[PDB]
Structure formats: C-alpha cells, structure tokens
C-alpha cells in the first residue's frame, strides 16, 4: 500500500447514466460477461496464492541511518571525517532527487485527472513544483559531474556572499 497523504487523490465523482431510449446497452451485457469470465477466476487464484503466502511469514525492514555531523565541522585534510560527511551528503542528494520525482509525478497526475481544463485545481501543485524546483536549481544545479560535496558548499558561500553584496547595495 501507500500513504494517501504523499500520493494524494481527490475524491471520486461518478454519475448515474439515465438511458433515454431502449436499444439497450451492449457494453452492459459485455461487462457482466467480463465479470463472470475474468473477475471470479482471477480472484479465486489470488485468494489461493494469498493463503499460500500467509502460511508462513517473511518480513523485510527499512534500512535507516544516523546523522554523522557535518562537512562544516571537518578540518583541512582529515579523510576519516570528510568520508562520512560526503557520503551523508550524497545520500541526501539521492533522496532529494526522488523528492523531485515525487513532485513531478504529482504534476503528471494532476494533468491527467483534471482533464481538458488544466488550470483548475492544478495551480497549487504547479506552485509547489516551481517552488521545490527553484530550490533545486538554486542548490544543486551548476556544479557539473565531479561533485563531491565541496563544490556545493563553495556554491553556497559564493551565492550567499553575492546576495550579501546585493542587500548591502539594497541597504
């Protein structure tokens, strides 16, 4: 399963079709035949397989980590500090890429659910998409292929120093 609050779904809206005239309705007979020829046997097969699964019990756990301190607390060379620092940063980088993947899947799903009126009830998700992706464009973008962690902190210092000069001019 999945949380309904990270992959959100609006509530369902489904009409009840009122037939004006009486031919009637080939697809209703065909979907009842579909139910009787497909829906029952696959349900019986899945129920058998689920009983065979629930005879025994496996479990897999989620791997979790700790917070090794910083790269801002590591010294000149000290390779057994920078190692834990940059692996912690690289795992943050992977999980942040997947944050961007989740938001972009939400944008795709808002496109396909809301139909031929795109701009109704997709303003909020496009807003948060441009927000998180503006953060990504600011934070990880223009460093290249040989990122380790140190070019990211150099970009951090250079950007906040440039904005410090900008707000000094704005003072």
């Amino acid at each position: 399963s999945w949380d309904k609050d990270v992959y959100p779904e609006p509530p369902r809206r489904t009409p009840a079709p009122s037939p004006q005239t009486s031919l009637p309705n080939p697809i209703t007979y065909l979907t009842k035949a579909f139910d009787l020829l497909v829906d029952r046997p696959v349900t019986l097969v899945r129920e058998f397989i689920e009983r065979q699964h629930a005879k025994n019990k496996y479990y897999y756990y989620h791997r979790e980590f700790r917070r090794v301190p910083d790269i801002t607390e590591c010294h000149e060379k000290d390779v057994l500090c920078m190692f834990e620092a940059e692996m912690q940063w690289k795992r943050d980088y992977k999980v942040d890429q997947e944050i961007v993947n989740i938001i972009q899947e939400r944008l795709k799903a808002c496109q396909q659910r809301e139909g031929e009126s795109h701009r109704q009830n997709c303003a909020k998700e496009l807003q948060q998409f441009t927000q998180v992706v503006k953060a990504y464009q600011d934070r990880y973008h223009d460093l290249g292929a040989h990122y380790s962690a140190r070019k990211c902190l150099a970009k951090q210092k250079q950007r906040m120093l440039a904005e410090r000069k900008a707000t000094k001019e704005a003072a």
Partner: protein, 71 residues
C-alpha cells in the same frame, strides 16, 4: 535475499574497510610529503645524518715532537 545472504557483503563491512583504508593511505601521504621536506632542508643546511660526505679522518693526525721547532 538469498543472493545477498550467500554471496555479497554488508555495507558495514565495506564501509569500515573504506574508512580503515583511508586512514592507512592518509598516513602514507603525510609521511611522504614530510619525507621530501626533511630531505630538502637536510640537503640545504646539512645538519642531519643523511648527506654527510666523508671528510678527513683525524686519527692519523699524530702530534709529536718533530725535527724543526717551528712547524
């Protein structure tokens, strides 16, 4: 799960291997740069026991009463 159990290694094993191996080779690099700095200053000033080319051995210098008084 069976593939990871019978063949592969834990990330703990490989992770502590990387960390120990960085400790070893950091010692190696620091000793190598310290070696060449010691060598350059020891060749420059000469105070050390490496670059001492053999001068005169004074054990053969045997002071004694000679023939001529003013040596």
């Amino acid at each position: 799960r069976w593939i990871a159990r019978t063949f592969f290694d834990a990330p703990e094993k490989n992770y502590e291997r990387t960390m120990a191996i960085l400790q070893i080779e950091s010692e190696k690099a620091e000793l190598r740069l310290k070696e060449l700095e010691v060598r350059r200053l020891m060749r420059a000033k000469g105070d050390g026991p490496w670059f001492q080319y053999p001068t005169i051995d004074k054990a053969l210098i045997d002071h004694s009463p000679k023939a001529t008084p003013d040596n």
